[PDB]
Amino acid sequence: EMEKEFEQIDKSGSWAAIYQDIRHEASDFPCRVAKLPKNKNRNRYRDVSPFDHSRIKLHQEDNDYINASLIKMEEAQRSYILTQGPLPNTCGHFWEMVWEQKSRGVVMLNRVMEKGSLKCAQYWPQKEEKEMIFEDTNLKLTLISEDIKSYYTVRQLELENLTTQETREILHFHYTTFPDFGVPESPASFLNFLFKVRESGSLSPEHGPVVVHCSAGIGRSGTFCLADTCLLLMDKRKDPSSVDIKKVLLEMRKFRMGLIQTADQLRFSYLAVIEGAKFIMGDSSVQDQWKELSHE
Numbered sequence: 357e358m359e360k361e362f363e364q365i366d367k368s369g370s371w372a373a374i375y376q377d378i379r380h381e382a383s384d385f386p387c388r389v390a391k392l393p394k395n396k397n398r399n400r401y402r403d404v405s406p407f408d409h410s411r412i413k414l415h416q417e418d419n420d421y422i423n424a425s426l427i428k429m430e431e432a433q434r435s436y437i438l439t440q441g442p443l444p445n446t447c448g449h450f451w452e453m454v455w456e457q458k459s460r461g462v463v464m465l466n467r468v469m470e471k472g473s474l475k476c477a478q479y480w481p482q483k484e485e486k487e488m489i490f491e492d493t494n495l496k497l498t499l500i501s502e503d504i505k506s507y508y509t510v511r512q513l514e515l516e517n518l519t520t521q522e523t524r525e526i527l528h529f530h531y532t533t534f535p536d537f538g539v540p541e542s543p544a545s546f547l548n549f550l551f552k553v554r555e556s557g558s559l560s561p562e563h564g565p566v567v568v569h570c571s572a573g574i575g576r577s578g579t580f581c582l583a584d585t586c587l588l589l590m591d592k593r594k595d596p597s598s599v600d601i602k603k604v605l606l607e608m609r610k611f612r613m614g615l616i617q618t619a620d621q622l623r624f625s626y627l628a629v630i631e632g633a634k635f636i637m638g639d640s641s642v643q644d645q646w647k648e649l650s651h652e
């Protein structure tokens with residue numbers, strides 16, 4: 357059981373060890389395409405690649421490569437695309453993927469600048485009146501409205517296939533307050549954010565997979581996906597205890613390497629799942645407690 361194991365690991369001070377065990381046991385698959393020299397400038401990090409078997413392919417004729425993975429959670433029956441923060445030359449590719457995968461939501465779990473560096477290209481419009489055109493992929497992107505809260509912002513974007521003049525509404529969920537070092541302020545603000553994403557519909561099976569990223573698309577993206585899937589699972593079974601966080605994580609690492617980057621992120625994941633489980637099991641009021649504790 358989850359809380360039991362949590363305290364025991366806390367008491368034994370062995371998160372570093374537990375996490376390192378997950379690292380040792382994690383799947384290792386080839387990333388041949390990511391590593392082709394022609395794709396060198398499509399990767400933000402040398403050490404962060406999509407496996408060949410689970411990578412998302414652009415329907416481009418030219419070069420179908422983007423650093424992005426399909427995490428397909430069979431039992432939970434939810435899918436996620438995890439990707440790196442777009443680069444100045446892959447913003448086009450990014451929206452092409454969003455378009456071709458029929459995604460409804462984009463969860464961004466980083467700020468454009470962190471620790472004094474540029475973690476991500478400015479890949480969406482910041483003002484209604486300056487829409488963005490992506491020439492390489494023939495897509496138009498327009499800011500329709502935005503709802504700024506204390507520690508996250510939700511934007512409504514319109515994505516137009518210039519080739520066919522067909523258009524969609526994309527929801528952009530931007531978590532801005534994950535700390536530079538350490539883990540978010542509390543479970544509460546993080547869970548409050550996840551639940552906003554869930555309520556948007558962006559996770560429904562009727563849409564393509566939600567697109568989730570931070571800078572590398574593994575650490576904070578891992579935490580978000582792991583928590584969502586774990587809660588989803590205990591919701592489906594209404595049995596908090598059959599859910600093995602570490603086992604779920606290893607299952608996700610079959611699809612993308614390095615999900616969850618620090619032992620502290622792992623401990624935070626437990627925290628968020630344990631806390632979020634309160635809501636899952638019939639306690640509706642807990643979600644209102646997170647909204648207030650998040651200070652949005």
Ligand code: VO4
Binds near residue numbers: 571574575
């Ligand atoms: O940009 V991330 O994979 O280190 O949280």
